[PDB]
């Protein structure tokens, strides 16, 4: 008598990292085979990742991943002639949202003060591992949670902000690919005062020791207040 499994859907946001874990013991008794894939194709989008030995699917999103993502997981019996035999299908969705406001809150009105580190690199060209694999080497740096740390490409060329309070120079000379900005929120409507120690930042950053640590180039950093919402 087969057992139906569901699956909750899910929402993501992008330049947010995205993580959820897919019952997979659920859905695959006997060692069968378990596919996670788009719904209707063999592939995921491009924006996740599968890892079967943790059960994980992961991401990060960017703004052509906007929208509804159904996503099949499967599973499968080996067959003695070596075919894959599909035994149930389950299918949830992913919602992708556009904006995260830059909250991971502060009150209406009040500027958030976040701080940008600019790097020499297309997140387009990058894998979606990749993409979460230079979020978590920043972790030592913002001292900030994976998941509470922005990604998203520049856009229009821009590498500056120029209403930014603090800020500083990396270690790259030339900036050779359209470049990505990793953000992270300091607090509510800082200034120069009250903003923390920053030195953890800055320091590495121009000394070359963040992009070593990265995989990436380092262009700068700023600190800037952003308006809400």
């Not at 946001?13 to 995205?18: A, E, K, L, M, T």
């Not at 978590?136 to 309070?165: C, G, I, T, W």
């Not at 800020?167 to 120069?192: D, F, R």
Request: aromatic share 6%.
């Amino acid at each position: 008598v087969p057992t139906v499994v569901g699956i909750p859907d899910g929402t993501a946001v992008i330049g947010r990292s995205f993580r959820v874990s897919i019952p997979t013991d659920l859905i695959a008794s006997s060692g069968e085979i378990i596919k996670v894939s788009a719904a209707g194709k063999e592939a995921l989008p491009s924006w996740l990742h599968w890892d079967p030995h943790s059960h994980i699917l992961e991401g990060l999103p960017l703004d052509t991943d906007k929208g509804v993502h159904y996503i099949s997981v499967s599973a499968a019996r080996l067959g003695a002639n070596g075919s894959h035999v599909p035994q149930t299908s389950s299918v949830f969705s992913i919602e992708v949202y556009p904006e995260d406001h830059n909250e991971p809150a502060c009150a209406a009105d009040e500027p958030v003060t976040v701080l940008t580190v600019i790097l020499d690199a297309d997140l387009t060209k990058m894998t979606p591992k990749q993409r979460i694999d230079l979020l978590n080497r920043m972790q030592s740096f913002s001292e900030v949670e994976l998941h509470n740390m922005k990604l998203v490409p520049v856009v229009n060329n821009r590498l500056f902000d120029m209403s930014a309070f603090m800020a500083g120079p990396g270690n790259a000379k030339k900036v050779v690919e359209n470049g990505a900005l990793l953000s992270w929120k300091l607090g509510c409507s800082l200034n120069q005062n009250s903003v923390p120690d920053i030195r953890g930042v800055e320091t590495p950053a121009r000394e070359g020791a963040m992009s070593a640590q990265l995989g990436y180039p380092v262009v700068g950093w700023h600190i800037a207040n952003k308006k809400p919402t």
